[PDB]
Amino acid sequence: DYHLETERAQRQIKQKNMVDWIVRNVMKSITPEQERLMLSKCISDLKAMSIKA
Amino acid sequence: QLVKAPIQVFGIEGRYATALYSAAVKQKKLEAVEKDLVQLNASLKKFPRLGELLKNPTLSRQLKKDAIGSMLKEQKAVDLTSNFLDLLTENNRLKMVDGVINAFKTIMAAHRGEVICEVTSAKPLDEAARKDLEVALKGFLKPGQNIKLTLKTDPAIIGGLVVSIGDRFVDMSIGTKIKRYTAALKTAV
Amino acid sequence: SNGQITAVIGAVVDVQFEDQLPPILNALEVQGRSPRLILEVAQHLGENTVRTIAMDGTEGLVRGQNVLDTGAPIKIPVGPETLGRIMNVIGEPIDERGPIVTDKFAAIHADAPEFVEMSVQQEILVTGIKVVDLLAPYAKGGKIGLFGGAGVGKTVLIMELINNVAKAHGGYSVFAGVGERTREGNDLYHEMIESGVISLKDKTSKVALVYGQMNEPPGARARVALTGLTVAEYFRDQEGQDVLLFIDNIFRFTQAGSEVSALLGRIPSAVGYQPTLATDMGTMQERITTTKKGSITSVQAIYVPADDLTDPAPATTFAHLDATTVLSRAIAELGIYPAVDPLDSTSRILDPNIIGEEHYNIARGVQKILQDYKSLQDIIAILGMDELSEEDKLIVSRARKIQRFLSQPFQVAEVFTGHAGKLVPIKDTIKGFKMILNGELDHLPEVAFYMVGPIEEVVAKAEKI
Amino acid sequence: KAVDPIQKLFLDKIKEYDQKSKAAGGKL
Amino acid sequence: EISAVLEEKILGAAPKENLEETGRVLSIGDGIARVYGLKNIQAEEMVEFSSGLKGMALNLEPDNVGIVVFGNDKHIKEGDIVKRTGAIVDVPVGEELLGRVVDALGNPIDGKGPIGSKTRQRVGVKAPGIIPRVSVREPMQTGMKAVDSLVPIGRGQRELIIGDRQTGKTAIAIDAIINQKRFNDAQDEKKKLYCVYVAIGQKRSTVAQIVKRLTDTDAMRYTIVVSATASDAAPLQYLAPYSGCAMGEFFRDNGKHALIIYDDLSKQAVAYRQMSLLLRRPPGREAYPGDVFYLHSRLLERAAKMSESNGGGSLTALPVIETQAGDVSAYIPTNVISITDGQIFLETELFYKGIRPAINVGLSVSRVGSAAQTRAMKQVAGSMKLELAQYREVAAFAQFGSDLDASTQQLLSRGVRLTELLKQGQYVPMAIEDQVAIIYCGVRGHLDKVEPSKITKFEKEFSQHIKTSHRDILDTIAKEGQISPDTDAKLKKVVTDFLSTFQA
Ligand SMILES: Nc1ncnc2c1ncn2[C@@H]1O[C@H](COP(=O)(O)OP(=O)(O)OP(=O)(O)O)[C@@H](O)[C@H]1O
Ligand SMILES: Nc1ncnc2c1ncn2[C@@H]1O[C@H](COP(=O)(O)OP(=O)(O)OP(=O)(O)O)[C@@H](O)[C@H]1O
Ligand SMILES: [Mg+2]
Ligand SMILES: [Mg+2]
């Protein structure tokens, strides 16, 4: 039970640490060329939903 | 007997608007009564003293109908809109003259079949963006339809596209998409 | 014509029609529902919009859903084909025995019979219950109410009346389960098929069951009593039969009306009830009567909320009943069953010219001793039994013997009590209370008078001690 | 069958975290 | 490992973007959001707000839709986007909820991960009718001596646990949940019973301590805890009994048997009164709405015993009602008494005297009665019920009875042993064979020489001797299903031997 709770405590802090690391890394990594590509994909997906009727 | 409106408008202000629409479509003055009502509403917005005068409950209704009549002769309103505003001042209903006009605008927009579209983007764009967005929005149109497009800018959605229709809505934006992904991270295990 | 749903708020649905409005109390049928959803028109709101009450659940209803006008009120099957069958508020069979194939239908909304079509004759209906047969006798053809709270015993009392009266009855019976337990409906249904009152094999059934229970929406619970009336009205009028109508319980009709009235946009009445409490009850209760064409003996269990007899729904029901049987919780906590209050139950046939001089004098003598006991009980509670030596102690001793002797074991309560059920003839009842009033049994212990029917079983129980 | 670019970016951040964590000997 | 789970959760949570019919919040306040739009929305359909809160479309009106918010109304502002879920209000159901603590919407709150349920069931399903039901004939073993003998509960019954505050209402309900471990561990699946504990308006610490008690006693493996505590919104406390009932109706409709506890329905009526008063509905008795009876009646009627053509399953309800100063004549308790199949009344006066559980024997009713208990228990508890009634009649003569008759003294002495017999410690439910043997010894006169202060110690030691030295007696009782006069003589001899061996 001690090893299980130690593993659970280490798993919980690693999950919390990787969550805030991913949030900070995703927010700090914003590029305009990828933003325009995602904008074009959103327009194409909107056009695909209009066709799907 | 009243002619059915293209869309249902609710409230007492919508009841007056449907009554005016039915009377104007039984005759052939649908386009005329829309033109002077828009010009009347533009006149009230451009001159706030008129709006405060009509909405004043202290003033007698004779002064209101004289002021309405004096400002409606310049509009060349003939029979329907003059009787409509006379009915509004006969009751105590001209306090929401903007309400009935806005409701009447909503009826006539659906008369032409126009559907309001609201597209929100993080940054403004044209040329390649506007060309494909018009065609994508036109794909939702049944025959006999028009697009009223309103473009908005908001940096709170990071990027992506938040496009809305008259009753339908999608949230294909970067800010909401990373939000549910982070929610999936916290609820993973 | 064809309407469309405008607003759905609980059990109340607003439907707007285009050409012609259906009249009030007309039945409307919603189209896109796999089971039948029936709307009953209640009022016209203006602008060709009617406000209706749904007879089933309103979940899954959208605004603009098409609603068809049937052109008539709720019509339910009536006749011999309903005997042995269970039907709901709208006449659909819920016994899983197929459709009710009949050519006769009747609207659940009907006018009460006029003043000319009234029967003034009153004859005593002997039950076999000593407290009922002595103090508040039931009339053979008349309205009987069973007032009581929760758990004081009204279902048991009305099941004993079915066991005693309805088994040996030359006619038809109708049971209207109105806002009660579905378990009790299953118990009563299997009791009928076991006692032979309902025959699943041939057409010798004698009782029709109509059930709208406490799991039903307020629209169904406020109209299922009318469906039981309509079956009983057909038997009285179109066949000239003498009909028994057991309603359990009629308070749920009024209670469901108050729940709908909150959504009908009415200013609430006293204790939050509907403004039309007395008029809706009066319209329903005046249809349950004996006319010159036929007779209806109605027994109606009446729930009182918070054990309050001054509540508007039981108070207005008191004037609709020939005989009232008020069940008390204080008597039930003393172990006296049935817990009928002797000083709160009336009959309207407790007359020397109807039930006899000796029956009337014994009943008035019993009530006089019990009223004297209630006056002395405040001295007994605080000070004690030391009062007036011989005189008041004899009053207390006789009254406590009478209170024990009013109790009686029921045949329907034999399962959970162990005491065998007793059916006591009314001659033995008045003889038994005359012996107690004359002082012939003052030497017996008062335990011997408890839970034994005849007075010969009292002396046999005393000798056993 | 094109995948979401945010999903690909999230997978890259997971791989970047895993490479840096293994280069740090399991430390935060 | 953790990276792989994190990656598969990202890939598995595809957005699946599509256009949804939406509305706009007009006004939010008092737990009711008025929403402009949603033309094709259904009545009682679940919605989603932009903040993630769910809501139920209560009022459909021509201009707006009134939505009951399942959460705090500080997360909703005017002008928000309200999306249709497309489905009437429903919760996850299944065996994946066993061992899990959830809220009123079915979302897990114990932090053990998501719920892998593949089925959902509406919370507003109507109760079964006359035909699919059948009589209640299978026993519900609460493990309590005073309950299982004097107020016997069956499978498919609604038994009310009513009393004042801090009288043991939760203790009875939790011990009934714990007691089913002996049936769930066995291979006889017809006696297996799943449990649903619904906590309405309680403290969240109290619910956590209950879950700890169920986890220590291993009773959590077959228990679902639906929690809508005192910090939760009134719509959540209103919805939670129906959510738990739907989870219990999964077992009822699939041939299994479930027990559900509503702790307590008096707090759900308070939450529903709050919703009704904030909706401007006309208050009635004690400011309650007129449909507060239909609030509990439509809930409890779903607890039923099904016929063999419907799988033979059942749902057993144990509603809890808290009275004020022992007033069972109040509005809400009288409503539930008129719904349920009998009540178990707990007394404050008996609780102060050390009698635990403080069950009022004379005021506890089981409308099902002896039809749903074993032959051995029914044969013995029938005699104990008569003897307790005899002791109750002559209890008034014990106040001044300095000189009393031998028959009356025997009745008083027997009743004292029987009253001390029904006492039972908390969290120790008893098997039905142990209950039958102990009640049989106290009802035949074996304890007339044993002092009433040593009955509980005699209960442990004599049962241990039976479980060790005279197991053939239990085998004969289990085979016969009752107590034979030959076994009565053998039990007389081993009692005399045991009392002589303890002291002589
Ligand atoms: N005649 C009787 N003899 C013995 N016990 C009785 C009798 N009548 C009632 N009881 C007791 O009272 C209980 C309540 O029975 P019953 O269902 O008739 O009450 P009720 O007034 O219909 O209550 P509810 O409001 O729950 O329908 C019974 O289960 C039984 O314990
Ligand atoms: N048989 C018993 N033996 C010993 N202690 C008991 C017994 N029954 C109850 N108790 C104790 O009495 C206290 C009150 O009981 P419990 O909390 O179960 O009552 P309740 O009616 O749920 O009160 P609440 O108003 O908090 O819901 C608790 O501390 C409990 O441990
Ligand atoms: Mg009843
Ligand atoms: Mg508690």
Side-chain angles (χ1 to χ4, degrees), chain E residues 104-287:
Chain E
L105 293 176
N107 310 312
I109 57 177
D110 51 358
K112 294 178 177 298
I115 305 171
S117 71
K118 213 183 180 61
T119 46
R120 301 182 69 84
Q121 186 173 342
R122 299 216 248 258
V123 303
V125 179
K126 62 203 65 55
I130 308 286
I131 300 305
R133 301 193 184 200
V134 83
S135 294
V136 173
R137 289 175 193 182
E138 303 175 359
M140 167 67 51
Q141 311 282 355
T142 56
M144 206 68 55
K145 283 173 291 183
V147 174
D148 289 8
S149 54
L150 297 170
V151 218
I153 308 177
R155 295 203 171 187
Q157 193 191 337
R158 316 168 291 264
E159 187 72 21
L160 181 57
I161 308 172
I162 183 178
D164 284 354
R165 58 169 183 271
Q166 308 179 196
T167 52
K169 300 180 298 300
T170 306
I172 295 182
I174 291 307
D175 290 340
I177 295 180
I178 296 176
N179 189 45
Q180 321 301 325
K181 184 181 176 298
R182 59 173 41 90
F183 307 107
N184 286 262
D185 293 1
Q187 302 183 9
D188 190 13
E189 292 188 3
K190 289 307 168 183
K191 289 186 175 56
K192 279 186 172 59
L193 186 81
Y194 302 92
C195 296
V196 178
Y197 178 73
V198 185
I200 311 122
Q202 296 179 357
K203 304 192 291 182
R204 191 172 294 171
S205 63
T206 308
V207 184
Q209 294 152 15
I210 285 175
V211 173
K212 178 61 176 179
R213 177 63 62 180
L214 298 175
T215 318
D216 292 339
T217 61
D218 208 57
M220 203 57 193
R221 293 185 175 183
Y222 51 88
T223 313
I224 310 168
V225 176
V226 185
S227 180
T229 177
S231 183
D232 284 7
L236 289 174
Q237 306 175 15
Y238 153 83
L239 184 66
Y242 302 102
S243 305
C245 184
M247 300 170 191
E249 277 187 311
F250 173 80
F251 303 106
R252 183 198 75 196
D253 296 323
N254 289 263
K256 305 168 183 299
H257 300 265
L259 171 73
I260 193 174
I261 289 95
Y262 308 102
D263 199 3
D264 44 312
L265 284 189
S266 56
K267 297 190 186 302
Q268 193 219 11
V270 167
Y272 186 62
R273 178 177 61 178
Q274 170 182 328
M275 298 169 57
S276 301
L277 292 169
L278 294 180
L279 274 168
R280 296 279 174 176
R281 290 175 171 175
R285 218 178 210 91
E286 305 182 24

Side-chain angles (χ1 to χ4, degrees), chain C residues 151-172:
Chain C
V152 302
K154 301 185 301 294
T155 308
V156 168
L157 181 55
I158 204 176
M159 284 294 286
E160 183 65 31
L161 285 151
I162 292 172
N163 188 87
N164 294 345
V165 180
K167 277 184 56 183
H169 181 247
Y172 294 144

Side-chain angles (χ1 to χ4, degrees), chain A residues 14 17-18 21 25 29 41, chain D residues 3-5 13 16-17 26:
Chain A
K14 282 178 182 299
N17 178 266
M18 72 201 310
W21 194 92
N25 273 73
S29 59
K41 186 174 182 176
Chain D
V3 215
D4 306 8
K13 296 307 183 180
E16 187 182 342
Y17 185 89

